[PDB]
């Protein structure tokens, strides 16, 4: 039931999503091992993701969380990158793959840094990189990220040295406390708490 609508590069909406992608690239402590070496992207396509059922699922859960959190959904726009992106756009986020988890436990992870989500496009640790060249820093092959509407509700703040939610909380905020340029990561435990609003097709660019 999913439709993808191309945005024009002349459209303010395209431009805004591109700027959020470009402006949230940072350096990573792996020197580029997982995601590649780059400071910016070549954005090839930005599509709006339209699915009435998945949207309704999301707004129903958002209402539940908002009411539990004293009329505050605490809704954000966040990146998600993974090998599941093609499944997600059609069937929604699925918490039966929360067990994979990460530094903040089982759950579905989102990032404020686009470049953090870029590290997961080819799997955990970048997997073995792109299918065609087996290169985690491939400048040729096209990548995809989602830019998602995410309901955090009452979020448990977890400082980081870089499953069900904590009792009474709807999500976890993983906040790096050592790297002062690293933005937060977030974890949800119900797939209905995120909607994949934009599908972004891009290349990382080789620094000049
Ligand atoms: C931990 C993890 C695992 C996976 C998965 F296993 F590949 F699905 N995808 C992720 N995708 C992200 O966009 C992200 C953002 C911030 C922190 C972690 C993650 C993340
Ligand atoms: Zn490649």
From Swiss-Prot:
**What post-translational changes are documented for it?**
Ubiquitinated at 'Lys-48' and 'Lys-63' by RNF146 when auto-poly-ADP-ribosylated; this leads to degradation. Deubiquitinated by USP25; leading to stabilization.
Q: Which residues form the PARP catalytic domain?
A: 8-208
Q: Give a brief account of the tissues where this protein occurs.
A: Highly expressed in placenta, skeletal muscle, liver, brain, kidney, heart, thymus, spinal cord, lung, peripheral blood leukocytes, pancreas, lymph nodes, spleen, prostate, testis, ovary, small intestine, colon, mammary gland, breast and breast carcinoma, and in common-type meningioma. Highly expressed in fetal liver, heart and brain.
Locate the residues binding Zn(2+).
Answer: 130, 133, 138, 141
Annotated compartments = Cytoplasm; Golgi apparatus membrane; Nucleus; Chromosome, Telomere
UniProt record similarity statement:
Belongs to the ARTD/PARP family.
Subunit annotation: Oligomerizes and associates with TNKS. Interacts with the cytoplasmic domain of LNPEP/Otase in SLC2A4/GLUT4-vesicles. Binds to the N-terminus of Grb14 and TRF1 with its ankyrin repeat region. Interacts with HIF1AN. Interacts with RNF146; this interaction leads to ubiquitination and proteasomal degradation. Interacts with NUMA1.
Give the protein's function. Poly-ADP-ribosyltransferase involved in various processes such as Wnt signaling pathway, telomere length and vesicle trafficking. Acts as an activator of the Wnt signaling pathway by mediating poly-ADP-ribosylation of AXIN1 and AXIN2, 2 key components of the beta-catenin destruction complex: poly-ADP-ribosylated target proteins are recognized by RNF146, which mediates their ubiquitination and subsequent degradation. Also mediates poly-ADP-ribosylation of BLZF1 and CASC3, followed by recruitment of RNF146 and subsequent ubiquitination.
- Which protein are we looking at? Poly [ADP-ribose] polymerase tankyrase-2
What is the originating organism of this protein? Homo sapiens (Human)
* The encoding gene: TNKS2
């Amino acid at each position: 039931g999913t439709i993808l609508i191309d945005l024009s590069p002349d459209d303010k909406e395209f431009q805004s999503v591109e700027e959020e992608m470009q402006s949230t690239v940072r350096e990573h402590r792996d020197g580029g091992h997982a995601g590649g070496i780059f400071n910016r992207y070549n954005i090839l396509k930005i599509q709006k993701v339209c699915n009435k059922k998945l949207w309704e699922r999301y707004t129903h859960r958002r209402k539940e969380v908002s009411e539990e959190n004293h009329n505050h959904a605490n809704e954000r726009m966040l990146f998600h990158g993974s090998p599941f992106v093609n499944a997600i756009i059609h069937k929604g986020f699925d918490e039966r793959h929360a067990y994979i988890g990460g530094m903040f436990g089982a759950g579905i992870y989102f990032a404020e840094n686009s470049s953090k989500s870029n590290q997961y496009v080819y799997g955990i640790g970048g997997g073995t990189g792109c299918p065609v060249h087996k290169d985690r820093s491939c400048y040729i092959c096209h990548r995809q990220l989602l830019f998602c509407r995410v309901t955090l509700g009452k979020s448990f703040l977890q400082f980081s040295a870089m499953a069900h939610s904590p009792p009474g909380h709807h999500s976890v905020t993983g906040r790096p406390s050592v790297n002062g340029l690293a933005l937060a990561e977030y974890v949800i435990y119900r797939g209905e708490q995120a909607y994949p609003e934009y599908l972004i097709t891009y290349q990382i660019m080789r620094p000049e």
